[PDB]
Design an enzyme around this catalytic site. Structure first.
Site, PDB file in Angstrom:
ATOM      1  N   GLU A 134       0.864  -1.173   0.000  1.00  0.00           N
ATOM      2  CA  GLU A 134       0.000   0.000   0.000  1.00  0.00           C
ATOM      3  C   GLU A 134       0.905   1.229   0.000  1.00  0.00           C
ATOM      4  OE1 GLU A 134      -3.699  -0.750  -0.123  1.00  0.00           O
ATOM      5  OE2 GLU A 134      -2.322  -2.177  -1.023  1.00  0.00           O
ATOM      6  N   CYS A 146      -0.631   9.756   3.816  1.00  0.00           N
ATOM      7  CA  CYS A 146      -0.651   9.255   2.443  1.00  0.00           C
ATOM      8  C   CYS A 146      -1.867   9.773   1.680  1.00  0.00           C
ATOM      9  CB  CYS A 146      -0.649   7.731   2.452  1.00  0.00           C
ATOM     10  SG  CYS A 146      -1.905   7.036   3.497  1.00  0.00           S
TER      11      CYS A 146
HETATM   12  N1  LIG Z   1      -1.303   3.484   0.880  1.00  0.00           N
HETATM   13  C1  LIG Z   1      -1.361   3.705   2.291  1.00  0.00           C
HETATM   14  O1  LIG Z   1      -2.315   3.301   2.959  1.00  0.00           O
HETATM   15  C2  LIG Z   1      -0.267   4.463   2.968  1.00  0.00           C
HETATM   16  C3  LIG Z   1      -0.402   4.812   4.333  1.00  0.00           C
HETATM   17  C4  LIG Z   1       0.587   5.567   5.022  1.00  0.00           C
HETATM   18  C5  LIG Z   1       1.746   5.904   4.339  1.00  0.00           C
HETATM   19  N2  LIG Z   1       1.910   5.521   2.989  1.00  0.00           N
HETATM   20  C6  LIG Z   1       3.138   5.930   2.334  1.00  0.00           C
HETATM   21  O2  LIG Z   1       4.232   5.732   3.184  1.00  0.00           O
HETATM   22  C7  LIG Z   1       5.218   6.683   2.860  1.00  0.00           C
HETATM   23  C8  LIG Z   1       5.670   7.380   4.137  1.00  0.00           C
HETATM   24  O3  LIG Z   1       6.239   6.476   5.050  1.00  0.00           O
HETATM   25  P1  LIG Z   1       7.817   6.251   5.054  1.00  0.00           P
HETATM   26  O4  LIG Z   1       8.535   7.548   4.793  1.00  0.00           O
HETATM   27  O5  LIG Z   1       8.195   5.660   6.382  1.00  0.00           O
HETATM   28  O6  LIG Z   1       8.100   5.309   3.793  1.00  0.00           O
HETATM   29  P2  LIG Z   1       9.282   4.502   3.329  1.00  0.00           P
HETATM   30  O7  LIG Z   1       9.078   3.845   1.937  1.00  0.00           O
HETATM   31  O8  LIG Z   1      10.412   5.396   3.488  1.00  0.00           O
HETATM   32  O9  LIG Z   1       9.571   3.579   4.463  1.00  0.00           O
HETATM   33  C9  LIG Z   1       8.631   2.546   4.752  1.00  0.00           C
HETATM   34  C10 LIG Z   1       9.199   1.330   5.497  1.00  0.00           C
HETATM   35  O10 LIG Z   1       9.968   0.523   4.605  1.00  0.00           O
HETATM   36  C11 LIG Z   1      11.213   0.326   5.227  1.00  0.00           C
HETATM   37  N3  LIG Z   1      12.203   0.207   4.174  1.00  0.00           N
HETATM   38  C12 LIG Z   1      12.952   1.204   3.578  1.00  0.00           C
HETATM   39  N4  LIG Z   1      13.711   0.657   2.625  1.00  0.00           N
HETATM   40  C13 LIG Z   1      13.495  -0.714   2.570  1.00  0.00           C
HETATM   41  C14 LIG Z   1      13.978  -1.769   1.806  1.00  0.00           C
HETATM   42  N5  LIG Z   1      14.962  -1.554   0.786  1.00  0.00           N
HETATM   43  N6  LIG Z   1      13.524  -3.013   2.012  1.00  0.00           N
HETATM   44  C15 LIG Z   1      12.603  -3.286   2.969  1.00  0.00           C
HETATM   45  N7  LIG Z   1      12.102  -2.285   3.737  1.00  0.00           N
HETATM   46  C16 LIG Z   1      12.522  -1.015   3.557  1.00  0.00           C
HETATM   47  C17 LIG Z   1      11.415   1.481   6.129  1.00  0.00           C
HETATM   48  O11 LIG Z   1      12.403   1.250   7.069  1.00  0.00           O
HETATM   49  C18 LIG Z   1      10.050   1.648   6.697  1.00  0.00           C
HETATM   50  O12 LIG Z   1       9.848   0.762   7.761  1.00  0.00           O
HETATM   51  C19 LIG Z   1       4.623   7.640   1.881  1.00  0.00           C
HETATM   52  O13 LIG Z   1       4.985   7.347   0.572  1.00  0.00           O
HETATM   53  C20 LIG Z   1       3.169   7.399   2.083  1.00  0.00           C
HETATM   54  O14 LIG Z   1       2.351   7.803   1.026  1.00  0.00           O
HETATM   55  C21 LIG Z   1       0.903   4.800   2.292  1.00  0.00           C
END
Ligand SMILES: NC(=O)c1ccc[n+]([C@@H]2O[C@H](COP(=O)([O-])OP(=O)(O)OC[C@H]3O[C@@H](n4cnc5c(N)ncnc54)[C@H](O)[C@@H]3O)[C@@H](O)[C@H]2O)c1
Ligand SMILES: Cc1cc2nc3c(=O)[nH]c(=O)nc-3n(C[C@H](O)[C@H](O)[C@H](O)COP(=O)(O)OP(=O)(O)OC[C@H]3O[C@@H](n4cnc5c(N)ncnc54)[C@H](O)[C@@H]3O)c2cc1C
Ligand SMILES: O=C(O)[C@@H]1CCCO1
Ligand SMILES: [Mg+2]
Length: 1211
Positions: free
Chosen positions: A790, A824
């Site tokens: 998501e 998001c």
């Molecule tokens: N569609 C939804 O319901 C929804 C809800 C909330 C947030 N979001 C999205 O989340 C993002 C914001 O959160 P964020 O800044 O923490 O996002 P992010 O993509 O930076 O990080 C998300 C998670 O993935 C982990 N991660 C980072 N790199 C990784 C890798 N190479 N392999 C595995 N895991 C990895 C991070 O440590 C963290 O726990 C925004 O893009 C937002 O739109 C989507």
């Protein structure tokens, strides 16, 4: 650094015994409120008989004696009457009558009014109320257009002229007492000679900007001078007075902004009161929403204790008898009068905001309503409060505002035979109460005075007040409506509500058809509870719990099944003030991440053997523990993740709702045949650090899977606390392990050999990397590792010229700048129709300058920090690139205190084309585009063209625009005439499509089924619709003798839930809809002819088109296809060139499935939800391909209270 929460929400003054008694009654159970009111309202049998006589006399006189006549004369339908008045309203905007008349006679009367005249019907909801008495939130403008053409073609110029004259008279004479104070004062002489008095209201309320409040102040000031000069020393009882609304006088009139209210609003009211005193006229403070009652008392108290106002008894104040605090408010006011040496005028009303208060309490999850829910309860309250007022006429002047003849007669005889002018008075609203009070004022009637509340102004300020009047006039429970209903007898009208209530089996029982907020979902589950930040008891106990939470030494550790592991340890700092250390985190080595997965794998059979109802019991216990700990959790979230108190309440409520929803969904579905996947890796974003963290984990656990929980690096502390709570609730340590750390820890979990599924919420960019890694893996059964991913949004809101600017700006401020844009769902592109864009942008910027940005441990803070320096720099780099293109960029100023944290100010950037945006910018940055109305369809294309599809808003009152836009936009969560950040679990199931998600939606009924190897049938998941192309395909299969495939095709057609269309239970004043659509074009990768037939049947039954892998070589298998089927079928050699796809179906052995899965992961664009099966599985299992994953869920939330009220609650 200041001590955290040291200044969270100190009250304006220490709460006296009388003030405390008010607060204690705020949400008191209705069965507790009514018995003392019944006793206080009791009158002798003599008075009750006498009052019934008087009431009957009054009603007989009223029943013994407009647009309706225009409708009758021209035989108009209702829609024709509404359309006529809309036309008349527009024609009156032509300032030169000669030009207007020529336009009528020469263009409109003969032919299309459309050619020679912003929709005509922007105000049709209001005219609809005038013509039919019913309110609709939006208008059917195609029906109105048809009706207007019909009536003009039938009746020509004469009906238009009658409409113009009728509109003129209504807008200038009936709706208002005058358009200016001078004209209203002129028209008052007729009734003043007859013994009426007046209280004038310069229409105006809910200031949005500083300039709004200044204009309203100047109107009140001018009115006081004019009224004071007209009074000419008549005094506060016989002379005219003024009424004001405090919300008109400051753009931030709320308890959260109490310091600004007392410092900035109070001096303006004092100045007006000083003028009213100097003219010796009455000045009345109107009562507004329930969460402003007690704040207004602090202004009343400071005014009444001000010696510059002494010697003047004209200070007035409304108390609403539909409110539970009303008698205790009266005790306070009566004592304040004694303390301050003045007589206070008290206007007793029932109340004007009932629908809104019901909806607000439900939205906010509060303990009860602050108003009664049965109309007769309000009547009893009114009578009981009248008794209190009449006992204290020495120190208050009771003003009984009512149009109810039974209420009036009860008080008239209650007051006794001794009367003098100044003892008390009655009140009525202009154009509503004169017929009744013509039977009251004067030595030949009851010889009691009545003051007429007189609205003054033009249409520019008329809307809100006019709708409230019209709703009151047409509501089926209202006296003014029932008196005209011939089906309602006089004996019913004179029925004593005090005795009716006294005789009920449960005195004070809640209305049977209104749910308490905790009961919104009935027997299915208990709604999460919020906290009332306008309640001083709550603010005081919260203050202490929040301070205590800041003294705790919060920690987060790698919590493996064998115990906590060591690692690199660092402090966690408040993003709004790096001097404020929140806690310490120890982060997971990549080796320990891999070890945790092996431990989960070893523990998986033990957790799967816990029966589903007992797993759900764990979730329900965890929800109770979080609800009980909410104050502490709020404080941690506030300081760790940059959240305001309101943000944090929503965060904790959402976690509670996920827990209880997945528990209930489990009890509805999961049985022994729904086997778990195995160890599931849950990777979560920082920005909802408890809600989405908890949601993913809870779903995976309750589906029988042990969980590796990897929270975002920025927010480990609240995640550790969430894991502690789940473990406390009974989740074994081996079934739920916490692995704090950065993206490398996430990647090590994703890659571990025993990982059986991945639940990811985060950026699209990171999700693509995860999908790539997973495509190298297969389950031990030789099938793809399920991935729920998501991801980001590029969320738009479209606003046309029919929307209400104030409502747009409120929803934009919330959607774009709540949590500094770190949702998001946040609004990223505001699309304004060209002819209203400047006015809306001016209002929006004025509202932006009233926001308080800072460290979030003060209630007065609206917008918090961004999470890190890296985030701040990434946002500022985008703002720079935009500046560098010459785009107009505007920002609000930040206080110097923000320097110790990482803040970005709310920013507004004007774009030329939506293509100026290239990526999700996760911060407080709103982009604006203007559009021409004829370009609406192309604008929707431009929104869809980003490839995202998460949230989307539409503000319009026009049904044709709603239908057009919602049938063409491609987003998972739609919102009509409201903000676009709603994600209420099981009400707005949340999740998007394209670059925004794989699905299934979190908080919806398809979610748990993705986390088991055999998905269950969700509650209510079916459809009677059969896809007609699927039907044609089955016939073609029968035509070529493929009997077993034709049978399977028909079975898929029936099993498909394509076309499901449900309304989900939720709050009043909202319609929350859930529908299943086709996903789009499905990539088909068959191996055999029968495999292709089965894949085709699955995709067609769910409404999809297909692209078949040309390398399959099965082209001859689809010869002589019916055109209807061929129209859905293409063949793809280069899969990357023929996308984007919306899913895939793969046939092969494990080796083929992995090879195909890797190639699909390489495709550009969205992540594809892939399903795979062997040839033998297709032959053996009719559900080898699951139809759950071939449909797309769409949530739509419509604010049906948006036109001003609630139509269903008007009954
Ligand atoms: N569609 C939804 O319901 C929804 C809800 C909330 C947030 N979001 C999205 O989340 C993002 C914001 O959160 P964020 O800044 O923490 O996002 P992010 O993509 O930076 O990080 C998300 C998670 O993935 C982990 N991660 C980072 N790199 C990784 C890798 N190479 N392999 C595995 N895991 C990895 C991070 O440590 C963290 O726990 C925004 O893009 C937002 O739109 C989507
Ligand atoms: C001169 C004047 C000034 C006023 N000023 C204010 C003000 O400053 N602020 C304000 O909020 N109101 C104010 N009101 C009251 C409001 O605007 C309505 O006019 C008033 O509530 C109608 O009551 P009633 O005795 O005329 O009619 P009724 O038909 O007797 O009573 C109608 C009222 O019952 C209540 N009600 C309806 N359904 C339910 C239900 N299911 N459960 C519980 N209660 C229910 C509502 O309050 C509704 O307005 C004022 C009224 C007048 C006449
Ligand atoms: O604005 C209203 O609807 C009420 C009635 C008059 C004053 O406040
Ligand atoms: Mg990150």
């Amino acid at each position: 650094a200041p001590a955290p929460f040291a200044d969270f929400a100190p009250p304006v003054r220490p709460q006296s015994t009388l003030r405390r008694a008010i607060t204690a009654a705020y949400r008191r159970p209705e069965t507790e409120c009514l018995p003392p009111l019944v006793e206080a309202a009791t009158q002798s049998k003599e008075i009750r008989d006498a009052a019934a006589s008087t009431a009957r006399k009054l009603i007989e006189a009223l029943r013994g004696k407009g647009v309706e006549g225009l409708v009758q004369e021209y035989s108009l339908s209702s829609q024709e009457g509404v359309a006529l008045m809309c036309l008349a309203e527009a024609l009156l905007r032509i300032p030169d009558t000669a030009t207007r008349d020529a336009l009528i006679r020469d263009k409109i009367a003969d032919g299309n009014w459309k050619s020679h005249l912003r929709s005509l019907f922007v105000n049709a909801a209001t005219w609809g109320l005038v013509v039919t008495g019913k309110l609709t939130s939006t208008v059917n403008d195609r029906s109105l257009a048809a009706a207007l053409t019909r009536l003009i073609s039938r009746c020509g110029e004469p009906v238009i002229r009658r409409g113009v004259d009728m509109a003129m008279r209504m807008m200038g004479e009936q709706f208002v007492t005058g358009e200016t104070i001078r004209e209203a004062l002129k028209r008052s002489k007729e009734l003043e000679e007859k013994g009426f008095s007046y209280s004038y209201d310069m229409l105006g309320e809910a200031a949005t900007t500083a300039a709004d409040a200044e204009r309203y102040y100047r109107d009140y000031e001018s009115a006081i001078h004019a009224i004071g000069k007209a009074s000419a020393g008549r005094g506060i009882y016989e002379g005219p007075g003024i009424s004001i609304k405090l919300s008109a006088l400051h753009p931030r009139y709320s308890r959260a902004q109490a310091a600004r209210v007392m410092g900035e609003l109070l001096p303006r009211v004092k100045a007006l009161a000083l003028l009213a005193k100097n003219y010796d006229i009455g000045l009345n403070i109107d009562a507004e929403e329930a969460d402003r009652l007690e704040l207004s008392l602090d202004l009343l108290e400071v005014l009444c204790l001000d010696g510059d106002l002494s010697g003047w008894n004209g200070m007035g104040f409304v108390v609403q008898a539909y409110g539970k605090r009303c008698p205790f408010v009266l005790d306070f006011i009566i004592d304040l009068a004694r303390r301050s040496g003045r007589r206070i005028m008290v206007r007793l009303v029932k109340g004007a905001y009932w629908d809104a208060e019901i909806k607000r309490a439900q939205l906010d999850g509060l303990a009860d309503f602050p108003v009664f829910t049965r109309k007769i309860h309000t009547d009893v309250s009114y009578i009981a409060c009248a008794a209190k007022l009449l006992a204290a006429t020495d120190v208050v002047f009771p003003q009984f505002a009512t149009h109810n003849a039974q209420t009036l007669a009860a008080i008239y005889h209650m007051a006794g035979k001794d009367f003098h002018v100044g003892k008390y008075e009655f009140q009525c609203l202009h154009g509503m109460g004169e017929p009744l009070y013509e039977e009251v004022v004067g030595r030949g009637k009851l010889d009691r005075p009545c003051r007429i509340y007189a609205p003054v102004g033009t249409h520019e300020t008329l809307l809100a007040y006019l709708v409230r009047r019209l709703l009151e006039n047409g509501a089926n429970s209202s006296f003014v409506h029932r008196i005209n209903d011939p089906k309602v007898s006089i004996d019913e009208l004179i029925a004593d509500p005090v005795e009716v209530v006294r005789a009920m089996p449960v005195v004070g029982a809640k209305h049977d058809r209104i749910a308490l907020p905790a009961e919104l979902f009935g027997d299915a589950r208990t709604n999460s509870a919020g906290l009332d930040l306008s309640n001083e008891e709550t603010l005081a106990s919260l203050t202490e719990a929040l301070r205590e939470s800041a003294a705790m030494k919060w920690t987060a550790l790698p919590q493996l099944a064998t115990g906590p592991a060591a690692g690199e340890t660092r402090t966690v700092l408040n993003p709004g003030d790096h001097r404020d250390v929140v806690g310490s985190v120890t982060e997971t080595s990549e080796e320990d991440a891999r070890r945790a997965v092996r431990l989960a794998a070893d523990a998986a059979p033990d957790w799967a053997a816990v029966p589903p109802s007992e797993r759900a019991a764990c979730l329900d216990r965890a929800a109770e523990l979080m609800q009980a700990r909410m104050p502490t959790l709020l404080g941690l979230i506030i300081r760790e993740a940059g959240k305001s108190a309101l943000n944090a309440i929503a965060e904790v409520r959402e976690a509670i709702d996920f827990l209880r929803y997945y528990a209930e969904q489990t009890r509805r579905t999961l049985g022994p045949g729904h086997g778990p996947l195995g160890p599931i890796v849950c990777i979560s974003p920082w920005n909802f650090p408890l809600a989405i963290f908890t949601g993913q984990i809870a779903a995976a656990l309750v589906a029988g899977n042990p969980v590796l929980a990897k929270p975002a690096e920025e927010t480990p502390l609240i995640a550790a606390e969430g894991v502690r709570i789940l473990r406390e609730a009974g989740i074994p340590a081996s079934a739920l392990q916490l692995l704090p750390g950065d993206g490398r820890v996430g990647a090590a979990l994703v890659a571990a050999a025993e990982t059986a599924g991945v639940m990811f919420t985060g950026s699209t960019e990171v999700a693509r990397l995860i999908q790539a890694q997973l495509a190298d893996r297969l389950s031990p059964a030789g099938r793809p590792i399920p991935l729920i991913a998501e991801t980001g949004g590029q969320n738009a809101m479209i606003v046309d010229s029919s929307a209400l600017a104030e409502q747009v700006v409120g929803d934009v401020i919330t959607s774009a700048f709540d949590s500094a844009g770190q949702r998001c769902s946040a609004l990223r592109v505001l699309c304004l129709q060209e002819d209203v864009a400047d006015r809306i942008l001016t209002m929006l910027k004025g509202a932006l300058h009233e926001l308080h940005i800072g460290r979030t441990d003060r209630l007065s803070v609206d917008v918090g920090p961004v999470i890190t320096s890296e985030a701040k720099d990434n946002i500022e780099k985008h703002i720079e690139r935009m500046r560098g293109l010459g785009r107009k960029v505007e920002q609000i100023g930040l206080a110097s205190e923000t320097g110790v944290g990482t803040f970005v100010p709310p920013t507004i950037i004007e774009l030329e084309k939506l293509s100026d945006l290239q990526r999700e910018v996760f911060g407080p940055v709103l982009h604006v585009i203007r559009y021409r109305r004829d370009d609406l369809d192309r604008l929707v294309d431009d929104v869809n063209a980003t490839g995202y599809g998460l949230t989307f808003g539409l503000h319009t009152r026009l049904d044709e625009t709603i239908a057009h836009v919602t049938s063409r936009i491609k987003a998972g969560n739609l919102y009509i005439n409201r903000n676009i950040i709603g994600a209420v679990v099981g009400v707005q199931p949340f999740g998007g499509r394209g670059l925004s998600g794989t699905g299934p939606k979190a908080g919806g009924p398809l979610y748990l089924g993705r986390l088991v190897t055999t998905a269950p049938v969700p509650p209510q998941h079916s459809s009677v619709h059969t896809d007609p192309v699927l039907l044609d395909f089955a016939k073609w299969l029968d035509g070529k003798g493929a009997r077993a495939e034709a049978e399977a095709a028909r079975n898929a057609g029936s099993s498909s839930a394509l076309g499901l269309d449900l309304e989900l239970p939720g709050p009043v004043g909202e319609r929350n809809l859930y529908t299943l659509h086709a996903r789009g074009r499905i990539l088909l990768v068959p191996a055999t002819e029968s495999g292709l037939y089965h894949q085709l049947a699955a995709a067609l039954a769910t409404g999809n088109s297909v692209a078949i892998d040309a390398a399959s070589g099965l082209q001859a298998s689809l010869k002589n296809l019916p055109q209807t089927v061929g129209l859905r079928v293409s063949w793809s050699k280069d899969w990357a060139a023929d996308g984007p796809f919306a899913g895939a179906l793969v046939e092969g052995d494990a080796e083929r499935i992995r090879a195909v899965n890797k190639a699909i992961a390489a495709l550009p664009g969205p992540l594809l939800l892939v399903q795979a099966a062997s040839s033998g599985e297709i032959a053996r299992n009719p559900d080898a391909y699951c139809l759950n994953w071939l449909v797309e869920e769409v949530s739509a939330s419509i604010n049906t209270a948006a036109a001003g009220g609630n139509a269903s609650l008007m009954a």
